[PDB]
Design a protein around this nucleic acid. Structure first.
Ligand SMILES: [Ca+2]
Ligand SMILES: [Ca+2]
Length: 314
DNA sequence: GGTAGACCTGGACG
DNA sequence: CGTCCAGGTCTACC
């Protein structure tokens, strides 16, 4: 059929594949696990969302990642658009090599890794990542997903429509900085988070030097990046780490949330040493982050993604 | 300097 | 139905 979300079976000539074993990527363990909140399994095993300013549907077989794009006459994805997908999933990073290393230096990781292969980090846009996680504050993935769709629907560029779903690109800084945005977001149910969205958009455009400021952070060191980000309203240590890890190429960035705390205590019998508090606090969270870094190495943030994602399946 | 409490909400239970 | 919960952050105050 010419309409609705496609499936690999229904429109074969419209899909192109990318060599990618499931051991290197598990869409069902990455896409809905709290990295990006903009992917939906519209059809069993088929995930649709905006990628590189276009709508796509992705699905995998044992050795292939099948892709289709909705831009003109419908056609299979081109090699270049396909590279956009490989970039998004950072496929040049061999997951089996990381899993092996983490497994060698951490017996518990190896145990869990046996049943959760394919968890890697998406390489996201700084803007979407910054605002999606500002909304993650005291929030569950599903509610977060809801706020983000509404926020994009109301302020993002309109793309194409599949069935009764109209896709929207992520809002720009200018749109998020616009007048009465907060009030509109509040009506969209973002709660106090509405305030931070507006505030951080204005702060970036009117105080920090605009988009270029956020983007040039990719070249900065994790330490610098993380400090800069904590300036913005609504961006604390956790939100800042999520951003450094998922959007600024800071693989040693380790987000420390309630999940990681439970994991630390329950699976590593971890306790704060230099910290004053016994539970979550700005000092204990920092310490726990350094604990995971000393334990997993330069890509601790990625290792973190595996266990976090695995901890959601509980 | 290191906390306790305020700020929003739709599914979650008991 | 009423308290609890989820990828927190901010800040007046001890
Ligand atoms: Ca929480
Ligand atoms: Ca801040």
């Amino acid at each position: 059929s010419e309409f609705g979300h496609r499936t690999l079976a229904s429109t074969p000539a419209l899909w192109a594949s990318i060599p990618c074993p499931r051991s290197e990527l598990r869409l069902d363990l990455v896409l809905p696990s709290g990295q990006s909140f903009r992917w939906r399994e519209q059809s069993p095993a088929h995930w649709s969302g905006v990628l590189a300013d276009q709508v796509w549907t992705l699905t995998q077989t044992e050795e292939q990642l099948h892709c289709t794009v909705y831009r003109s006459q419908a056609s299979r994805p081109t090699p270049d658009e396909l590279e956009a997908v490989r970039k998004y999933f950072q496929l040049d990073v061999t997951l089996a090599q990381l899993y092996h290393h983490w497994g060698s230096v951490d017996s518990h990781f190896q145990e869990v890794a046996q049943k959760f292969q394919g968890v890697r980090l998406l390489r996201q846009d700084p803007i979407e990542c910054l605002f999606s996680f500002i909304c993650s504050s005291c929030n569950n993935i599903a509610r977060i997903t809801g706020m983000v769709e509404r926020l994009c629907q109301a302020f993002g560029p309109r793309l194409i429509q599949l069935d009764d779903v109209t896709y929207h690109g992520f809002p720009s800084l200018q749109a998020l900085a616009g007048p009465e945005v907060e009030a509109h977001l509040r009506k969209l149910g973002l709660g106090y988070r509405a305030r931070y969205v507006s505030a951080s958009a204005r702060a970036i455009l009117e105080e920090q030097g605009g988009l270029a400021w956020l983007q040039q952070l990719r070249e900065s060191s994790y330490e610098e990046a993380h400090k800069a980000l904590c300036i913005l309203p609504g961006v604390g240590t956790q939100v800042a780490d999520c951003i450094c890890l998922m959007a600024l190429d800071k693989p040693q960035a380790v987000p420390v949330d309630v999940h990681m705390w439970h994991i630390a205590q329950r699976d590593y019998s971890w306790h704060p040493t230099t910290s004053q508090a016994k539970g979550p606090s700005p000092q204990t969270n920092k310490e726990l982050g350094n604990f995971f870094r000393s334990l997993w190495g330069p890509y601790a943030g990625w290792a973190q993604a595996v266990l976090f994602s695995a901890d959601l399946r509980q």
